From Swiss-Prot, chain A:
It is found in: Bacterial microcompartment. The lineage of its organism: Bacteria, Pseudomonadati, Myxococcota, Polyangia, Haliangiales. Gene3D superfamilies: 3.30.70.1710. This is Bacterial microcompartment protein trimer-2. Disruption phenotype: Not required for efficient BMC formation; when deleted from an artificial operon (Hoch_5815, Hoch_5812, Hoch_3341, Hoch_5816, Hoch_4425, Hoch_4426, Hoch_5814) being expressed in E.coli, normal BMC shells form. Artificial BMCs can be made in E.coli by expressing (Hoch_5815, Hoch_5812, Hoch_3341, Hoch_5816, Hoch_4425, Hoch_4426, Hoch_5814) or (BMC-H (Hoch_5815), BMC-P (Hoch_5814), and 3 BMC-T (Hoch_5812, Hoch_5816, Hoch_3341)). Cargo proteins can be targeted to this BMC.
Amino acid sequence: LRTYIFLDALQPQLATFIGKTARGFLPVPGQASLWVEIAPGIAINRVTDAALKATKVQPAVQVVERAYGLLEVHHFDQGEVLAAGSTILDKLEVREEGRLKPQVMTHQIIRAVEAYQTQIINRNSQGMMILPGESLFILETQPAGYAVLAANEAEKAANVHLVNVTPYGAFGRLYLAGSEAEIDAAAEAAEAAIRSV
Amino acid sequence: LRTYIFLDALQPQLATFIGKTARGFLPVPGQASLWVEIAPGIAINRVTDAALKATKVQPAVQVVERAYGLLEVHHFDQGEVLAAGSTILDKLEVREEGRLKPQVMTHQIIRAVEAYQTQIINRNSQGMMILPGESLFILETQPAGYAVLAANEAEKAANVHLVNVTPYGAFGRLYLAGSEAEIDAAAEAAEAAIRSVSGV
Amino acid sequence: LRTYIFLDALQPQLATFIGKTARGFLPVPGQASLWVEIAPGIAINRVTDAALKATKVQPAVQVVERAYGLLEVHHFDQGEVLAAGSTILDKLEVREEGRLKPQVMTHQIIRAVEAYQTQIINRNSQGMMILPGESLFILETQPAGYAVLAANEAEKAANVHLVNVTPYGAFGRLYLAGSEAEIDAAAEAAEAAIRSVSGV
Amino acid sequence: LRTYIFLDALQPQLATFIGKTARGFLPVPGQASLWVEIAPGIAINRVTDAALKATKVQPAVQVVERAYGLLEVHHFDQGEVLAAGSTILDKLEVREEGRLKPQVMTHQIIRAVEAYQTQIINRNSQGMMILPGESLFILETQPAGYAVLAANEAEKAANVHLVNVTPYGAFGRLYLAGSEAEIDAAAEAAEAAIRSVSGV
Amino acid sequence: LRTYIFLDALQPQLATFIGKTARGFLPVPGQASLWVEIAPGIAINRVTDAALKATKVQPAVQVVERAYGLLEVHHFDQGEVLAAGSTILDKLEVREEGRLKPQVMTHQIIRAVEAYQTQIINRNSQGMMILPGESLFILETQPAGYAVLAANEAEKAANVHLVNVTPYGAFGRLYLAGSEAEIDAAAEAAEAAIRSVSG
Amino acid sequence: ITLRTYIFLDALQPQLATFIGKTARGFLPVPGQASLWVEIAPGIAINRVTDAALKATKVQPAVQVVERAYGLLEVHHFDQGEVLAAGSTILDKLEVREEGRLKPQVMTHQIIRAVEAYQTQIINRNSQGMMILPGESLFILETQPAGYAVLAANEAEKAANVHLVNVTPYGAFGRLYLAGSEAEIDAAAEAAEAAIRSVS
């Protein structure tokens, strides 16, 4: 069990980013959302099947990457999602606390990003544009799944733009853009959330 | 000469969108930008060559379509971009006014788009994401090259988000997202810009 | 109103194929499914919005192609889908029978396809694989949206494999694979379904 | 029958370019290569099946395009490929000279291409890279399938680089790069090759 | 030498899957098929060159991924393929047994997969589609190359559908779909095949 | 921060610059420009390096790749002083000196003489640079960290008449493919290996 984290309600940009990029059943803002990462990757199919047979949740994500596998299930009813999470933990025979604790590989604020840099960031991103002169928050977590918690709590806490989030792979990466003050608040919220796991 | 439109200064989102999609030298906001659409599209390489050998402009775009060809050249110095444009028009043996006059084919404001619909829009888009509940402006131009004018002027006129712009084909398509009030102003600015262009 | 076709229940392979290629809310087998193709295409966003604001349907497909636009909406409740259809027709200010009557443009059965040909078919397809020696049904419809009706009814009628279906463009194209007799039955049902559609 | 051209032996770069882009059985240099373009395109699967059932040829290419269809079949032995053509001509009730006689719609040499322009060309190309300062030959043929003859004979006659070739659509497009002298010879050989083709 | 496995005759779905996804000279059902995986990845070009210079085999696959390299060569004549393999081993100065023995990290049957889950599996797959209500066999091997043996032997033994096989990467993954009993017979034959190779 | 790669190229050779321009996501260079490559871990932290170089100099970035584990930056300018000023800024920022970089090691280096057509066809289908043609020799080089592969490419191209087939200077291992005559490949390989060995 690499990642296990429950989002009580998806913020609009995160839900929209998942919808623009994920392969599965799109979530909408406000739905509860549970994320589960495990190894080996292909074995996530066992987790998905358990959750879907037990509850009415819908999966936005089942990724099997080089080494790991990641699942998202969602529903407008928090308890329906939480019911799916309990089922998953029973199938895995581990409790919520047996999850790997998230580590922050990088947390940095880059002020007044130059146009040359935003152009490359943006060409590699599918979320909101970072525009020249905006501040950039970059967060790298390990394992990758927890990046969504940082993204959701940051968006909840400040007026910022979700540029990109990658909650799978060796490392989970998050890009936010906004004014310096809003990015400061978004960064504080994201970090306070990762450390609360 | 189908399209010959000079943008005095690229607005930030349009410049960023070009940075996301162009296959040439990426621009940056504030640069002057000339877009030239021609028929036949195979001659675009000769037009590009004329502009580049005469001036210091950098080309963000050269698209050879099934019929039409599109070029973008830019520079911070408007003089470089207009020098390139003059070179092009003189080679084509046309005057700027000889360009096709653009027409607003289709224009629609869709208020408070539902979440389901913002997903299909977003998955077909590379610009800003439209969020559920935002209003959507959809514009079609003929010829298609002029859609970058609608995008640039809309962004100048209103606090809207550029979701996507496609300035090549028979019709140029533009998608903007924002509040209803912002989209109202962006829509009018986009349409007023298209109709302000003299030509054939 | 180019295409307007109601599918009472999505067959498993067609629903799975939509799940593979659609950029909207993926459907599941057994759901009612309405497909709407219009000209001008760009106006599909207004059609989609009207259906989503009026009903609980979810959209699997919204394709802005070139001159046409295609929408799919679905729901397990046939009533919600029919309600969305009437909402669309009223928004378009047309009646169902005002749709273009579809025509079988081309229909072919290739018996016992060679391995060298199945490789190329499969590389241009996202559905089931056609295996060497299986028969291949190739269908073209006009308008293109009705191709999903041919696919759904063929799967209803025969034990065949959905290789690929493309219900957007000037002609809709369908590829099915299976034994000769089953392909004969699939082609019959697909062609009959197309001819059973009323329109102009 | 739009295109019917027999290439006695694929030249190395053209064979390599096909290997890079085709979705069938990759050829190698020196093999005989027959290219068949037909209308309607959807009938191409039926022509492919006839050729494969009658001979040992392997198909590198089968593209069904919005109007036309293109097939490539090849074999180390010219006879096999000629046998496949003989079968295709019999299946079509047409002779070799019943093909459309191709014509050179466009032919341009752009000398000393600027670095900015070679970038965009290269990002839209899968063959050899054109390097800054090299000359660029741009040819268009109609029917499009004959563009591979222009490519094969240009490569036979001159030390030039195949940048890209597209043998389908309304026009076949050929981009070559090299020194001014090499490109001059390649252009003349290409144009002569197309002129040497008989047909309606 | 990470993977070295010989398939006497490619089954139809496996051959077709290779044909739809591989970058190379596409094989056809019935051809003999040899798979070789090594590290360093880029060094697979030496292996390919030896096999092609010595025999008439055609390569369906030469993948250079993050870390490893994978080759497939095939021919209707098992003799050409076996001659190509021994040439490879001769050039590597290795014997067939010096290969890493494949492990079985994941092997699971998921019965009656829900439509939500099949839609995702399918959107990530290029083989046959798994349909809602079918059973799913999932198998992971290390090294990845050996997945093709499980696929070929599974298809030979049971009426199942090849959904996907990825014989390159850190781990070789196999997805089969079908009825539960047929999937059980397929899994039986696949697992027996994997653990029956020395190394 | 771990400084995996730091290497300065005095002048980009034509094929390398063209390959960067054909493949990279950024502001793409032209031949003759000075080029600095910086690879670090953690991957996303490359953004700090980029920011420091851009805020202090006029360099433009051709590359900022954040892959599975590492991040790679390229900055370039015709004035070597701008590029070296950017490099000094980066090193001062990272608080490391030039020689604190990970020393590159020639991992795999091999020449494959007279490559068969079956093999070139696969290599080419997996490559974006020049073609390798059957019968040409192939130089394959692996480097660790991957960033230093560009030095081998540039010096190999400077030293011999070879073709850049592909270079991947990011990932776990940096890989270089060159094609040419046996003798030209021999010289290119020697020049490439000597350069890598000479990095402190």
